[PDB]
């Protein structure tokens, strides 16, 4: 919070996605790099558009420290960033908690198995059960 001097460049008004598009470059002398929970709310107060309608990424540290450059963007509202922001960024920032899901290997194998089955499959379990006795 000391001499972070965060600022934005190349601000262009993109209303089709209803956002402000720009690159963000920070000077952080005597600092490793600024994080999301710092840069996101700092970008929010400088812009006064919303709080969770801010997104930052990129953020390569300059060779030898000192400053960092990346990309940023601000929405008109949080209810408008929900309709546009990519899912992985929403989950990363805490705007969504993704439920655990089956792996690609397992998901594709299950699709292979149920493609082997014609119909819904309720009647198949009965015939196998009825024919399991002998």
């Amino acid at each position: 919070s000391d001499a972070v001097t965060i600022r934005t460049r190349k601000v262009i008004s993109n209303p089709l996605l209803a956002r402000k598009q720009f690159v963000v470059d920070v000077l952080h002398p005597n600092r490793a790099n600024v994080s999301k929970d710092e840069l996101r709310e700092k970008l929010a107060e400088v812009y006064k558009a919303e709080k969770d309608a801010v997104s930052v990424f990129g953020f390569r540290t300059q060779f030898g420290g000192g400053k960092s450059v990346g990309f940023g963007l601000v929405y008109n509202s949080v209810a408008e960033a929900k309709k546009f922001e990519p899912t992985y960024r929403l989950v990363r920032y805490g705007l969504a908690e993704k439920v655990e899901k089956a792996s690609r290997q397992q998901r594709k194998q299950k699709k292979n198995r149920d493609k082997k089955i014609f119909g819904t499959g309720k009647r198949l379990a009965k015939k196998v059960a009825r024919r399991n006795a002998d």
């Binding site: 060779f63 030898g64 420290g65 000192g66």
Partner: protein, 184 residues
């Protein structure tokens, strides 16, 4: 597949390996300039070959030919910018007479040596590699920089290095603990 990433060589090995006159000169060159390899000379002579080839083809064309009027001027501006040839010429003369000594004279290894912050080409090379140098605002550790003549007044020690405050260095930090440990 994704489009191939182009690459090109930067050095060229001499046709005859065991040349006493050439071997002595190259190792003589490395000492005077603190270079680690003969490849560091091979590339400069390879870079010079592309330049003499460029000017030779251009100079075969006639005067007031648009090709050399554009390409010759561009080569002049690039070479003047890097300081290899003298800036008080407007005659496309020095290019074909450029010697190997001119290119590695403009390298940052010797550039910071004669700017007084290094005191030796070998000390500079170690200084260069240990990141105690900023060309503009940015720390470099490239012994072969080709200063663009707008950075000789811009050279300075890296703010993220000793002699800059709030940064004594790891060996100094250990002696800082020794200062308190000595009494205790």
């Amino acid at each position: 597949p994704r489009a191939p990433r182009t690459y090109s060589k930067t050095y060229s090995t001499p046709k005859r390996p065991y040349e006493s006159s050439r071997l002595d000169a190259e190792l003589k060159l490395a000492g005077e300039f603190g270079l680690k390899n003969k490849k560091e000379i091979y590339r400069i002579s390879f870079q010079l070959s592309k330049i003499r080839r460029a000017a030779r083809d251009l100079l075969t064309r006639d005067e007031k030919d648009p090709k050399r009027l554009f390409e010759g001027n561009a080569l002049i501006r690039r070479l003047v910018r890097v300081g290899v040839l003298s800036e008080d010429k407007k005659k496309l003369d020095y290019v074909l007479a450029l010697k190997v000594e001119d290119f590695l004279e403009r390298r940052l290894q010797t550039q910071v040596y004669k700017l007084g912050l290094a005191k030796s080409v070998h000390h500079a090379r170690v200084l260069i590699t240990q990141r105690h140098i900023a060309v503009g605002k940015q720390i470099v550790n490239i012994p072969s920089f080709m200063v663009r003549l707008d950075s000789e007044k811009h050279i300075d020690f890296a703010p993220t290095s000793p002699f800059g405050g709030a940064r004594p260095g790891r060996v100094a930090r250990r002696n800082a603990a020794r200062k308190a440990e000595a009494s205790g």
